[PDB]
Design a protein around this ligand. Sequence first.
Ligand SMILES: C[C@H](Nc1ncnc(N)c1C#Cc1cn[nH]c1)c1nc2cccc(Cl)c2c(=O)n1-c1ccccc1
Length: 816
Amino acid sequence: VKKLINSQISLLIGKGLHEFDSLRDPEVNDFRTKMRQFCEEAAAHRQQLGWVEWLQYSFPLQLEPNRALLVNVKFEGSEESFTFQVSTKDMPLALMACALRKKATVFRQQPEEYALQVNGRHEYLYGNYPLCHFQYICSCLHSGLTPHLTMVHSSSILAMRDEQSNLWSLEQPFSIELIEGRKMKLVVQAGLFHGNEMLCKTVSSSEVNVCSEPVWKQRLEFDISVCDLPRMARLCFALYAVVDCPIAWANLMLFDYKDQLKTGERCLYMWPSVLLNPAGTVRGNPNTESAAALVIYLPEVAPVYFPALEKILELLREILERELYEHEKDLVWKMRHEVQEHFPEALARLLLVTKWNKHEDVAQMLYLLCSWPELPVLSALELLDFSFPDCYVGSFAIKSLRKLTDDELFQYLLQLVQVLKYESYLDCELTKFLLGRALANRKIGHFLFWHLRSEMHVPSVALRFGLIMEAYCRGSTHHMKVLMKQGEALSKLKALNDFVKVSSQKTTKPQTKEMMHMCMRQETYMEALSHLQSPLDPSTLLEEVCVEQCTFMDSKMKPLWIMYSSEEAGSAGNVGIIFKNGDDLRQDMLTLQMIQLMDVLWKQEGLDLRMTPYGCLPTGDRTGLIEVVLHSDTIANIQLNKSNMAAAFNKDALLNWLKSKNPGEALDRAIEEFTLSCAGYCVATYVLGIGDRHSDNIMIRESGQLFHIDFGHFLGNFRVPFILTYDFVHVIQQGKTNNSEKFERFRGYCERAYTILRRHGLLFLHLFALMRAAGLPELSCSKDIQYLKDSLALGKTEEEALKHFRVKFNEALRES
Ligand SMILES: C[C@H](Nc1ncnc(N)c1C#Cc1cn[nH]c1)c1nc2cccc(Cl)c2c(=O)n1-c1ccccc1
């Protein structure tokens, strides 16, 4: 019985559990235990949660940041439905109060015992809040569509819970003896690093010939006392050749995870190259066989652990804040004590002057860290940055981070996961925290898994991600079932796309399309492809898959197009997803995630650019899912101006198009939608650098809202300036050649959107800092990020920045 599970875990996480054991690594062994029971006691807690507390776990709310409204309401055991009229300002209960009395009359005669399940979705309606504060309601009301809810009893929501049954004396210089290696001449650079910059000095070595397997036994000496290496400090090797050609690199913690200094001899299996790399990880390559190892000797010292801590309890400027000439590092460190007293939110600037190479400053720096008032989240995001490796800051950072909402957590989740690659050991506070939150919220649970599942093909993180995944599973056995269902859909889809690629090679679109439909209609594909939660959205219920509607785009990686339909969800149950295999999909997810962040900040200052935030989810190696936006066409299609329709100038295709989708008065609103979304995405794509936009990767929806697809290009990689296209300019202007009233309302939208993002310019900056961890080729250098500072123009005055933004815009009308 524990063997079925372990086995289902191996399947699910993409690595066999037996590969852990088989490592005889003690660090990994107590990781697996200290975490198995954090997680099971977490689940313990879970199966005794109250019923509403269960709803808040399995189906956490969806929420937006005077008039009336129609709502069909059901019950479980039946199909009889009543329509209502409630306003947008009622609570969920008014509805339920009113829902039972129209029953208490048919069945011929207590609203607090209930919840409104949205229909054919794992979404529910309950709480403090008005009706239109809800993400579904304020959404059905635009679409003007009737909400369809279900009165689900407390007895029913406990039934589901039930189902989910589970020292400092050493003052000589530190040095290593080099030994052998196993792949002109050969060089071996080595630095002592803490975070970003180095403690000691650069230390090359004896030259040898590429005649190698080489042997060095040169005693390599480092410029720093031993009593003064910090608790971290990573030692950082690098192997090249000249008469410079990079070869491999390798890092390692100078201390045991269990705290003690590292002696004495060990073997370093190195990762290759492309030139000395403090940021790569401090575990070694799994490729044992192929891998160039390096062997060194970490010398002896008597069993010196690293001192616990009541015994580091030992001990006009401000044209300053928010790079130095550090004839100013002084006054910062000098009067550090009332930095803490009178300026707490500059903790970071301080750590970035603290001496890590000498333990007296560190002990003193840490001394102010424990008394430090906690920070605002924006600040804690800063401290996660690589250049604050320190266990303690990271503890402080995590400490200040518990004041996150599950909503903001979900909003920064992709970065926090990237941060997991910096961590120097396995059992860190961030991991404990993420699993804590994840186990405590099933939407968080969902997306944490997939952020990890999607990287198990990358050797540098397969072990850690694997390890956490398994823990998550030990604490959520049921949710493991639901994720298998998903991973199997994706397994099959992949096979089906392989077939579609191959088949399309030798035959026509109707033939391959009709062939695919049979592949699908096999018993095995119908079972796998149906009746699962959507990896893109766990409240979306992919149920009965419509094969007649499935197709594939006749382009290079032949993405698939899968429609679905729930009968107990009606029209809002007919949804689709896109399978794409071939491309790395992490670039887009980042882009769509940031854009969605833009729509939140704008909405939080009362500005709705009617944006369009479709899910994008990478699931595996160059493989992931994209969410389908029904009722939408590419501009490029629309502008082909074909015959059929009911356009004398190509300029008018788009507008005519718009007209035919919105006759009578509805064309007013669509133009408006159009104008708003076009302001959003124009500013979105200008701030972010999104390149070569053309009518093939811009889509418009019948409502009018336009949105962008295919985000390959990013942060102005080929300075990307503002773009305004004549033919949306022509739609904005309702047809007219000279509609300055409608066009400048449009310029304002843009200016507002731009200024609102500028006041959070720092959030985006902190968030792009952490993503540097992600290996995204168009996001690695220090000055890919300066693109975002000169976009946001964050170093100018608000009246000045908007001066220059105004130049950029005006030059972009001028193209048309
Ligand atoms: C370009 C269009 N794309 C999206 N359509 C809606 N909703 C989205 N979410 C996306 C998307 C996307 C995307 C791709 N890369 N990054 C994001 C699209 N993508 C496809 C992908 C695979 C297979 C097919 Cl058969 C199609 C397909 O027919 N269209 C399409 C073309 C014109 C009119 C309607 C549909």
